[PDB]
Amino acid sequence: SKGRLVIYCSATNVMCENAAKTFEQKYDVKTSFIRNGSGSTFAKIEAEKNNPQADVWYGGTLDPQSQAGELGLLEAYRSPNIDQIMPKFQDPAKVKGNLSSAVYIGILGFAVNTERLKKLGIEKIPQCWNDLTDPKLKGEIQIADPQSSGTAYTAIATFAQLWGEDKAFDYFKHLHPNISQYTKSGITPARNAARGETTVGIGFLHDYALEKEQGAPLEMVVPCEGTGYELGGVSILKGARNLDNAKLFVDFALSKEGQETAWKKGQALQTLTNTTAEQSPLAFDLTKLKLIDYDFEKYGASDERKRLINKWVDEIKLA
Ligand SMILES: O=P(O)(O)OC[C@H]1O[C@](O)(CO)[C@@H](O)[C@@H]1O
């Protein structure tokens, strides 16, 4: 066993486990992970900043990792594999120097349980963000909570960029009566839509694509007004105990093999950032989508992330 590695993972358990096992088997490193939301994981790393408990932060959305970079929580390391990453996303965070790197892309949207829709007596599948404010969807939608979930923050930032911040919060307020719960995890609305516990889930479409691929009666929607996206992040923690192995993990996560195994074995259907990697047949093609130019440098920062989340809690979660 060539050393150890502790991962804070913010992707799904199945993806994290497959990455940790594939790394351990490829490189003989004793690898373990702890899984938590992108926002939850940031708070934990910030809290542990004097005596870091993990070596790398893998998966989840980029914005909290960018914020961690800004706050001095990360250790800069540019993997030679960055040369293979889509040039647009080679060094995308607020603070340059690859404190954080982009390992995948996820499209924000929603999906609809077409069988439950029918039971609600609704015949039209919603096609726009605006449709989700219709009163007939009372208690029939779920979205995550940005206090824990990177997905929820990606949505907030997407809406602020689309409509302007004030209209974004107006949207949250009109959406609110249709939300049955603000979920801790970004993926929970996908799971509950798949279950038919809810009719509409808002989140990253590859999660819905996997439920669909496994039989769920879901129709995925890229909303007609346009939408944003996540970059999945990988970052080394400042003070990492196993630095060398952390660098090796970053290499692997940015590698053709490390990215392909996410969809080949890890049941994770994000679009890959390594231009030499084979994409899943179910991965979204960004060139075909109505996407805003999501400003990672701007929203992966405290003056947006802490401000908007605290504002979201004040005006939406409370009143
Ligand atoms: O919203 P959360 O809980 O931080 O999780 C975000 C992550 O969940 C996923 O959608 C799971 O596939 C990831 O692509 C994304 O990075």
Short mmCIF file of C-alpha atoms and ligand atoms in Angstrom, two decimals:
data_model
loop_
_atom_site.label_atom_id
_atom_site.label_comp_id
_atom_site.label_asym_id
_atom_site.label_seq_id
_atom_site.Cartn_x
_atom_site.Cartn_y
_atom_site.Cartn_z
CA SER A 1 0.00 0.00 0.00
CA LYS A 2 1.67 3.10 -1.33
CA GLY A 3 0.27 5.50 1.29
CA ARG A 4 -3.20 6.73 2.22
CA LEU A 5 -5.82 9.20 0.95
CA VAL A 6 -8.92 10.69 2.58
CA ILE A 7 -11.53 12.14 0.23
CA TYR A 8 -14.33 14.56 1.00
CA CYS A 9 -16.71 13.59 -1.80
CA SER A 10 -19.74 15.63 -2.90
CA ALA A 11 -20.94 13.47 -5.81
CA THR A 12 -23.26 10.48 -5.32
CA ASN A 13 -22.16 7.62 -3.06
CA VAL A 14 -21.97 5.26 -6.03
CA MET A 15 -19.73 7.62 -8.02
CA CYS A 16 -17.50 8.38 -5.01
CA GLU A 17 -17.15 4.69 -4.10
CA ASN A 18 -16.25 3.76 -7.66
CA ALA A 19 -13.66 6.56 -7.84
CA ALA A 20 -12.12 5.64 -4.48
CA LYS A 21 -11.99 1.93 -5.32
CA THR A 22 -10.62 2.49 -8.83
CA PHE A 23 -7.90 4.80 -7.45
CA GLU A 24 -7.00 2.36 -4.67
CA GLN A 25 -6.75 -0.51 -7.13
CA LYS A 26 -4.85 1.44 -9.76
CA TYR A 27 -2.31 3.04 -7.42
CA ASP A 28 -2.33 0.88 -4.25
CA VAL A 29 -3.35 3.81 -2.06
CA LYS A 30 -5.49 3.04 1.00
CA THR A 31 -8.40 5.27 0.01
CA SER A 32 -11.48 6.28 2.01
CA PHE A 33 -14.17 8.91 1.51
CA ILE A 34 -16.82 10.79 3.42
CA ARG A 35 -19.79 11.95 1.36
CA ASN A 36 -21.60 15.23 1.95
CA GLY A 37 -23.21 18.07 0.00
CA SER A 38 -21.10 20.74 -1.70
CA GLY A 39 -22.23 23.43 0.74
CA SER A 40 -22.11 21.10 3.76
CA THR A 41 -18.59 20.05 2.76
CA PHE A 42 -17.38 23.65 2.44
CA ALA A 43 -18.64 24.50 5.93
CA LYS A 44 -16.86 21.45 7.28
CA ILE A 45 -13.56 22.25 5.57
CA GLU A 46 -13.77 25.87 6.73
CA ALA A 47 -14.42 24.65 10.28
CA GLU A 48 -11.48 22.26 10.11
CA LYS A 49 -9.06 24.78 8.58
CA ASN A 50 -6.59 24.67 11.50
CA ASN A 51 -6.29 20.87 11.40
CA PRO A 52 -7.56 19.51 8.04
CA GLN A 53 -9.14 16.06 8.18
CA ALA A 54 -9.25 15.25 4.47
CA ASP A 55 -6.71 15.46 1.65
CA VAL A 56 -8.90 16.14 -1.39
CA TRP A 57 -12.36 17.48 -2.12
CA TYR A 58 -13.88 15.57 -5.06
CA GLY A 59 -17.13 16.27 -6.91
CA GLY A 60 -20.05 18.52 -6.05
CA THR A 61 -20.36 21.93 -7.64
CA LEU A 62 -17.45 24.29 -8.36
CA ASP A 63 -18.81 27.42 -6.64
CA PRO A 64 -18.08 26.30 -3.04
CA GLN A 65 -14.62 25.02 -4.03
CA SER A 66 -13.92 28.37 -5.74
CA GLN A 67 -15.03 30.04 -2.53
CA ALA A 68 -12.74 27.79 -0.49
CA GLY A 69 -9.92 28.79 -2.86
CA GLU A 70 -10.64 32.46 -2.19
CA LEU A 71 -10.58 31.90 1.56
CA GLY A 72 -7.18 30.20 1.58
CA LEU A 73 -8.53 26.70 2.31
CA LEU A 74 -6.95 25.03 -0.74
CA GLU A 75 -3.52 24.00 -2.02
CA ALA A 76 -2.69 25.03 -5.62
CA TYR A 77 -1.69 22.18 -7.94
CA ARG A 78 -1.86 22.11 -11.72
CA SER A 79 -1.97 18.56 -12.97
CA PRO A 80 -0.27 17.89 -16.32
CA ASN A 81 -3.64 16.43 -17.30
CA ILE A 82 -5.08 19.98 -17.35
CA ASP A 83 -3.67 20.18 -20.90
CA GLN A 84 -6.36 17.64 -21.93
CA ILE A 85 -9.23 19.51 -20.29
CA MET A 86 -11.55 21.70 -22.41
CA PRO A 87 -9.55 24.97 -22.62
CA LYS A 88 -12.60 27.02 -21.51
CA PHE A 89 -12.59 25.08 -18.23
CA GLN A 90 -8.87 24.46 -17.63
CA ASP A 91 -8.66 26.97 -14.73
CA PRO A 92 -12.24 28.19 -14.18
CA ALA A 93 -12.42 29.26 -10.50
CA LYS A 94 -12.12 32.75 -8.96
CA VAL A 95 -8.51 32.45 -7.85
CA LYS A 96 -6.35 31.23 -10.74
CA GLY A 97 -3.52 28.72 -10.41
CA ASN A 98 -5.66 25.56 -10.19
CA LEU A 99 -6.59 25.54 -6.52
CA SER A 100 -9.63 23.86 -8.10
CA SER A 101 -10.05 22.00 -11.40
CA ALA A 102 -13.11 20.94 -13.42
CA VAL A 103 -13.83 17.20 -13.68
CA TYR A 104 -17.32 17.23 -15.18
CA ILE A 105 -20.27 19.30 -16.37
CA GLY A 106 -23.89 19.02 -15.24
CA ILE A 107 -26.86 20.77 -16.84
CA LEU A 108 -29.38 22.54 -14.61
CA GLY A 109 -32.99 21.82 -15.55
CA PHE A 110 -35.96 19.88 -14.36
CA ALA A 111 -37.74 16.65 -15.15
CA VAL A 112 -41.34 15.55 -14.92
CA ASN A 113 -42.96 12.31 -13.77
CA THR A 114 -45.34 11.92 -16.70
CA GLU A 115 -47.41 9.25 -14.97
CA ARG A 116 -48.01 11.41 -11.88
CA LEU A 117 -48.58 14.45 -14.09
CA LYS A 118 -51.46 12.56 -15.71
CA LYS A 119 -52.89 11.76 -12.26
CA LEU A 120 -52.82 15.47 -11.37
CA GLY A 121 -55.05 15.98 -14.39
CA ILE A 122 -52.38 18.00 -16.18
CA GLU A 123 -51.89 17.22 -19.85
CA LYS A 124 -49.13 19.66 -20.82
CA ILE A 125 -45.58 18.78 -19.79
CA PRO A 126 -44.05 22.00 -18.36
CA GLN A 127 -41.41 23.41 -20.77
CA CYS A 128 -40.22 26.62 -19.04
CA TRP A 129 -39.10 27.75 -15.60
CA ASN A 130 -42.20 29.94 -15.60
CA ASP A 131 -44.45 26.85 -15.90
CA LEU A 132 -43.34 25.65 -12.49
CA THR A 133 -45.23 28.51 -10.81
CA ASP A 134 -48.61 27.23 -12.00
CA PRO A 135 -51.02 26.70 -9.06
CA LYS A 136 -51.92 23.18 -10.21
CA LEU A 137 -48.41 22.14 -9.09
CA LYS A 138 -49.08 23.01 -5.45
CA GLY A 139 -46.98 20.73 -3.26
CA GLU A 140 -45.74 18.85 -6.35
CA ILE A 141 -42.19 20.18 -6.84
CA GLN A 142 -38.89 19.75 -5.04
CA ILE A 143 -35.57 21.60 -5.12
CA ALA A 144 -32.60 21.44 -2.76
CA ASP A 145 -31.62 23.90 -0.01
CA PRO A 146 -28.53 26.08 -0.77
CA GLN A 147 -27.40 25.88 2.86
CA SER A 148 -26.29 22.30 2.11
CA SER A 149 -26.62 21.85 -1.64
CA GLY A 150 -24.40 23.16 -4.42
CA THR A 151 -27.20 22.37 -6.89
CA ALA A 152 -29.53 24.77 -5.13
CA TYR A 153 -26.87 27.51 -5.32
CA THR A 154 -26.23 26.86 -8.99
CA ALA A 155 -29.97 27.45 -9.55
CA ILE A 156 -30.00 30.68 -7.52
CA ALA A 157 -27.01 32.00 -9.46
CA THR A 158 -28.47 30.87 -12.77
CA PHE A 159 -31.72 32.73 -12.04
CA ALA A 160 -29.87 35.86 -10.91
CA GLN A 161 -27.90 35.85 -14.16
CA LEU A 162 -31.00 35.12 -16.27
CA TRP A 163 -33.53 37.54 -14.81
CA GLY A 164 -31.50 39.78 -12.56
CA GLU A 165 -31.28 39.18 -8.83
CA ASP A 166 -34.54 40.83 -7.74
CA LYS A 167 -36.62 38.93 -10.31
CA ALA A 168 -34.80 35.74 -9.29
CA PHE A 169 -35.98 36.14 -5.71
CA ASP A 170 -39.47 36.98 -6.97
CA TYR A 171 -39.31 33.67 -8.85
CA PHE A 172 -38.33 31.83 -5.64
CA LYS A 173 -41.33 33.37 -3.89
CA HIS A 174 -43.80 32.37 -6.61
CA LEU A 175 -42.21 28.90 -6.79
CA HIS A 176 -42.36 28.48 -3.01
CA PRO A 177 -46.00 27.31 -2.61
CA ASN A 178 -45.35 24.45 -5.03
CA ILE A 179 -42.29 23.21 -3.15
CA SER A 180 -43.18 20.27 -0.87
CA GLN A 181 -39.68 20.30 0.67
CA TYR A 182 -36.35 22.04 0.19
CA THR A 183 -34.17 18.95 0.17
CA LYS A 184 -30.82 18.60 1.89
CA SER A 185 -29.28 16.89 -1.15
CA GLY A 186 -29.28 18.21 -4.72
CA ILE A 187 -30.21 14.79 -6.11
CA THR A 188 -33.17 14.12 -3.84
CA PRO A 189 -35.68 15.83 -6.15
CA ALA A 190 -34.55 13.40 -8.90
CA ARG A 191 -35.12 10.44 -6.63
CA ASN A 192 -38.51 11.64 -5.46
CA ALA A 193 -39.65 12.50 -8.99
CA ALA A 194 -38.58 9.00 -9.98
CA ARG A 195 -40.58 7.59 -7.03
CA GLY A 196 -43.64 9.66 -7.85
CA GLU A 197 -43.35 11.29 -4.41
CA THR A 198 -43.32 14.51 -6.39
CA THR A 199 -44.15 15.47 -9.99
CA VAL A 200 -41.27 17.81 -10.79
CA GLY A 201 -37.71 17.82 -9.57
CA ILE A 202 -35.27 20.63 -10.22
CA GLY A 203 -31.57 19.74 -10.36
CA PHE A 204 -28.86 18.45 -12.68
CA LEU A 205 -30.33 16.56 -15.60
CA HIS A 206 -27.80 13.67 -15.65
CA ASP A 207 -29.24 12.53 -12.29
CA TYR A 208 -32.70 12.41 -13.91
CA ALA A 209 -31.17 10.69 -16.97
CA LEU A 210 -29.90 7.86 -14.75
CA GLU A 211 -33.30 7.36 -13.06
CA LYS A 212 -34.88 7.38 -16.54
CA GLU A 213 -32.23 4.96 -17.83
CA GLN A 214 -33.20 2.63 -14.98
CA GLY A 215 -36.94 2.74 -15.73
CA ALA A 216 -38.38 5.89 -14.11
CA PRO A 217 -41.23 7.58 -16.02
CA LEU A 218 -39.39 10.88 -16.39
CA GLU A 219 -39.24 13.48 -19.13
CA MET A 220 -36.19 15.75 -18.90
CA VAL A 221 -36.52 19.47 -19.75
CA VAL A 222 -33.93 22.12 -20.66
CA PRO A 223 -36.15 25.10 -19.79
CA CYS A 224 -37.16 27.32 -22.71
CA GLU A 225 -35.82 30.55 -21.16
CA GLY A 226 -32.34 29.06 -20.96
CA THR A 227 -30.39 27.56 -18.09
CA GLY A 228 -27.02 27.24 -16.40
CA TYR A 229 -24.75 24.41 -15.36
CA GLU A 230 -22.27 23.15 -12.79
CA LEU A 231 -18.66 22.29 -13.23
CA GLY A 232 -17.77 19.42 -10.89
CA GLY A 233 -14.71 20.34 -8.86
CA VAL A 234 -11.61 18.68 -7.48
CA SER A 235 -9.31 20.53 -5.06
CA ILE A 236 -6.48 19.67 -2.66
CA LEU A 237 -6.98 20.90 0.91
CA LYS A 238 -4.37 23.28 2.30
CA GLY A 239 -2.59 21.26 4.96
CA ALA A 240 -3.45 17.88 3.40
CA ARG A 241 -1.64 15.15 5.34
CA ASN A 242 -1.16 12.97 2.27
CA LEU A 243 -0.13 15.63 -0.23
CA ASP A 244 1.64 13.43 -2.80
CA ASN A 245 -1.30 11.02 -2.99
CA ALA A 246 -3.66 14.00 -3.22
CA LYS A 247 -1.77 15.23 -6.29
CA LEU A 248 -2.01 11.70 -7.74
CA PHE A 249 -5.74 11.69 -7.12
CA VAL A 250 -6.15 15.06 -8.89
CA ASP A 251 -4.24 13.58 -11.85
CA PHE A 252 -6.56 10.55 -11.86
CA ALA A 253 -9.75 12.63 -11.56
CA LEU A 254 -8.62 14.74 -14.55
CA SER A 255 -7.51 11.68 -16.53
CA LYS A 256 -9.21 9.90 -19.43
CA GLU A 257 -9.58 6.77 -17.27
CA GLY A 258 -10.77 8.59 -14.14
CA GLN A 259 -13.47 10.48 -16.00
CA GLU A 260 -14.66 7.60 -18.20
CA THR A 261 -15.09 5.30 -15.20
CA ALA A 262 -17.68 7.73 -13.74
CA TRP A 263 -20.21 6.73 -16.40
CA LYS A 264 -18.79 3.32 -17.32
CA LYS A 265 -18.86 2.00 -13.74
CA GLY A 266 -19.77 4.81 -11.32
CA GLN A 267 -23.36 5.26 -12.49
CA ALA A 268 -22.74 8.96 -13.03
CA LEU A 269 -23.70 10.51 -16.33
CA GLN A 270 -22.18 14.00 -16.21
CA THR A 271 -20.48 15.37 -19.31
CA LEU A 272 -16.70 14.89 -19.10
CA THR A 273 -14.20 17.76 -19.24
CA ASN A 274 -11.28 15.71 -20.58
CA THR A 275 -11.39 16.11 -24.39
CA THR A 276 -9.78 12.72 -24.97
CA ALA A 277 -12.36 10.82 -22.91
CA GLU A 278 -15.24 8.87 -24.41
CA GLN A 279 -18.53 10.50 -23.35
CA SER A 280 -21.49 8.46 -22.11
CA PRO A 281 -24.11 8.10 -24.86
CA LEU A 282 -26.50 9.68 -22.34
CA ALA A 283 -24.29 12.70 -21.55
CA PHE A 284 -25.56 16.13 -22.60
CA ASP A 285 -23.88 18.03 -25.43
CA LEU A 286 -23.47 21.67 -24.41
CA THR A 287 -23.21 22.87 -28.02
CA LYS A 288 -26.84 21.81 -28.48
CA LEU A 289 -28.26 23.66 -25.47
CA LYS A 290 -29.57 27.13 -24.61
CA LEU A 291 -27.03 27.85 -21.85
CA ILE A 292 -26.11 31.10 -20.19
CA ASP A 293 -22.38 31.80 -19.96
CA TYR A 294 -22.33 30.86 -16.28
CA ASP A 295 -19.89 33.17 -14.52
CA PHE A 296 -17.96 30.84 -12.19
CA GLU A 297 -15.46 33.54 -11.21
CA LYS A 298 -18.27 35.82 -10.04
CA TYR A 299 -20.55 33.33 -8.28
CA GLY A 300 -17.76 31.16 -6.86
CA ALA A 301 -17.04 33.92 -4.35
CA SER A 302 -18.16 35.03 -0.90
CA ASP A 303 -19.71 38.33 -2.08
CA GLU A 304 -22.24 36.27 -4.05
CA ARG A 305 -22.39 32.87 -2.39
CA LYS A 306 -22.59 33.88 1.26
CA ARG A 307 -24.71 36.94 0.47
CA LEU A 308 -27.25 35.15 -1.76
CA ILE A 309 -27.61 32.08 0.45
CA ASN A 310 -28.12 34.17 3.58
CA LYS A 311 -30.63 36.30 1.63
CA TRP A 312 -32.35 33.13 0.41
CA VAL A 313 -32.66 31.87 3.97
CA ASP A 314 -34.07 35.19 5.20
CA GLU A 315 -36.64 35.76 2.46
CA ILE A 316 -37.62 32.25 1.34
CA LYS A 317 -36.83 29.64 4.00
CA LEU A 318 -38.12 31.91 6.74
CA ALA A 319 -40.15 34.87 5.42
O1 LIG B 1 -26.35 19.67 -4.53
P1 LIG B 1 -25.31 18.78 -3.90
O2 LIG B 1 -25.94 17.92 -2.82
O3 LIG B 1 -24.19 19.63 -3.34
O4 LIG B 1 -24.70 17.80 -4.94
C1 LIG B 1 -24.18 18.21 -6.15
C2 LIG B 1 -23.75 17.06 -7.02
O5 LIG B 1 -24.81 16.17 -7.17
C3 LIG B 1 -24.72 15.63 -8.55
O6 LIG B 1 -25.74 16.17 -9.35
C4 LIG B 1 -24.85 14.15 -8.55
O7 LIG B 1 -24.74 13.57 -9.80
C5 LIG B 1 -23.40 16.04 -9.02
O8 LIG B 1 -23.22 16.08 -10.39
C6 LIG B 1 -23.32 17.38 -8.41
O9 LIG B 1 -22.02 17.80 -8.45
#
